[PDB]
């Protein structure tokens, strides 16, 4: 004889009619009951715990959303923003960001029950800001819009933090703190945030992949998530190398700023970034053909005749170096910088 | 889909106000013994447990 009973009451006819009109897209009924009805509560709630703005946002109703957003006593505006960000509705997000509560970008990044969707609880975790949720959901236009208003993902501290803010957070709850750290890293390790947040995303994604790789070993619990985040940080750089068309684009992905770097010992390029990619074990970045052709041209290096030969040819040359080894030794000692040196 | 410590302790353990606390400061392990008895292996192999 038990039921869930998320409202524990019954609605009126002028409230069930308004909620059905808001849910199913009946724009003139909603307009008439907002203009010519004064004994109605706009914040009347469904059987499950949803008011009319949440039914309008959850069903992609832009006209009802823009019509409800001029009432100046609506509840659950931050939850409607989070639901529209998670579902991917760019026009509803741009309509909700014109409300006079996100006026100066006040509540887009970094208690007040603003993002609650019921009497008790938020839809996502309490640390999840709009920018973190937009980076989780790979929404490039919403991420660009939220970065345009000055919202950033705050980088979490080290695992052995002992500050006045790490200690009370870890003493209050040792589960929510680790979940908050992994949510911030899942936000930071996304291609939508990596491509739009920094000015050099290759170096940022390489260092972030290394940081998540060592954090997978420090925290033995929740390791299969840090490994996944590091793998997608590597996949970002590999996918950025794949869409290269010229030689200067390949040399800007594989090597850094070639005007502000040392050219090297010889006419070969500056190999400082590929050493870092081998150190961080980004294997598909090094096994990619655009890297393989450059490494082959450095590897051969004034033997282009022996490049196209066969393996039967490259056994006789090894035996020739085996016979005449002191000869090449003393001409390397006594006369460098020659045709053979 | 648990976020706090009290939600994990309400799924893994029962009503902690109406259960015996245990021999020491450890929680009441009566439900996890039942989950091992009934061989609910992913409930016990879950990271929150």
């Amino acid at each position: 004889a038990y039921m869930f009973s998320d409202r524990s009451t019954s609605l009126s006819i002028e409230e069930e009619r308004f909620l059905d009109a808001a849910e199913y897209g009946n724009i003139p009924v909603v307009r008439k009951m907002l203009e010519e009805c004064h004994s109605l509560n706009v914040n009347c709630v469904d059987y499950m715990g949803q008011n009319a703005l949440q039914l309008a946002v959850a069903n992609e109703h832009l006209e009802i959303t823009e019509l409800l957003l001029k009432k100046e006593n609506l509840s659950r505006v931050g939850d409607a923003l989070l639901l529209a960000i998670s579902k991917g509705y760019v026009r509803i997000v741009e309509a909700i960001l014109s409300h006079p509560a996100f006026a100066e970008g006040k509540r887009l990044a970094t208690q007040d029950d603003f993002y609650a969707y019921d009497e008790d609880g938020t839809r996502f975790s309490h640390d999840v800001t709009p920018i973190i949720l937009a980076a989780h959901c790979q929404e490039y236009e919403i991420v660009h819009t939220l970065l345009r208003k000055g919202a950033r993902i705050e980088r979490p501290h080290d695992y052995f933090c002992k500050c006045n803010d790490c200690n009370q957070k870890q003493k209050h709850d040792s589960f929510s703190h680790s979940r908050s750290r992994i949510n911030a890293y899942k936000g930071l390790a996304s291609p939508a945030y990596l491509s739009l947040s920094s000015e050099d995303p290759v170096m940022t994604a390489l260092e972030l992949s290394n940081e998540l790789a060592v954090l997978a070993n420090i925290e033995k619990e929740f390791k299969n998530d840090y490994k996944k985040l590091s793998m997608q940080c590597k996949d970002f750089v590999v996918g950025l190398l794949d869409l290269c068309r010229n030689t200067e684009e390949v040399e800007a992905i594989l090597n850094g700023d070639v005007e502000t770097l040392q050219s090297g010992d010889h006419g070969r390029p500056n190999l400082s970034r590929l050493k870092l990619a081998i150190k961080y074990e980004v294997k598909k970045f090094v096994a990619h053909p655009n890297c393989q052709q450059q490494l082959l041209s450095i590897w051969y290096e004034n033997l282009s005749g022996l490049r196209q030969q066969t393996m039967a040819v490259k056994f006789l040359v090894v035996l020739a170096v085996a016979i005449g080894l002191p000869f090449l030794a003393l001409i390397y000692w006594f006369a460098p910088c020659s045709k053979m040196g | 889909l648990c976020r706090n410590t009290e939600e994990v302790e309400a799924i893994l353990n029962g009503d902690v106000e109406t259960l015996q606390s245990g021999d020491h400061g450890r929680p009441n392990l009566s439900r996890l013994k039942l989950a091992i008895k009934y061989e609910v292996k992913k409930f016990v192999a879950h990271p929150n447990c």
Partner: peptide, 30 residues
């Protein structure tokens, strides 16, 4: 008490996540 409140919150989270999961199912021709 508190346990009934926590279980109500968790059952509501489960039903919303289950509706999300059935919305993530493929489209058939009916």
């Amino acid at each position: 008490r508190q346990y009934q409140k926590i279980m109500k919150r968790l059952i509501k989270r489960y039903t919303t996540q289950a509706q999300i999961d059935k919305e993530s199912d493929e489209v058939n021709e009916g």
